């Protein structure tokens, strides 16, 4: 039922309903020779949508834009990216230039800059400091603290109990750390305990790579980490 690389072509996109208003876009990427999987997700604000995250590259984001299109028909005014890599900003230039509004947090803003990566334009106030969160439409959009990044942040859909964890959180099937060139992994357990503080009633658990579950990924990917740290 939720798609793996076997099921996505290369440049195609699948949406995957979560719950009333709530979907994932899932794209796949080549590297090194093997093919990696990668989450966003998309939730209904009224008649209009917001996006969470780029499809990983432009080919990609483009092919995710086409697909809502077609499959759910309305508009995508604004996009957040959740951290700076090109999972998250790749095809933010797309993105505006059909006239998305592409938002990230400032920190997230200055370390795309630092890599060369794309940088939304619009700046999100108020997640400078782990345990912040704000509205932003139809989301809550929480700051954890350092996590895979250290500007990571987390998406809540209040309406469905949905917790998109990006990145920061890892899939079940994930028994090594993935990439943590840019992780604080001495933060990161702290981190994912704010994220279970802020949202206990979660029921559905997105990570940024693989399939969904509940709050059980949480204390997974704490101890996959744990154990990277003990290396
Ligand atoms: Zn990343
Ligand atoms: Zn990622």
Redesign the pocket.
Known sequence: EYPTVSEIPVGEVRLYQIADGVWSHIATQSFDGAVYP?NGLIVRDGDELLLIDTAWGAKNTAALLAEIEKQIGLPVTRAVSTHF?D??VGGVDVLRAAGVATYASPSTRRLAEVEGNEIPTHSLEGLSSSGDAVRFGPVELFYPGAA?STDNLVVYVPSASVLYG??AIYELSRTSA??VADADLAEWPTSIERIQQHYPEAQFVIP??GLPGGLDLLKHTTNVVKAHTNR
């Open positions: 990668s890599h999972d998250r895979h990006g990145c993935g990439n940024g790579h």
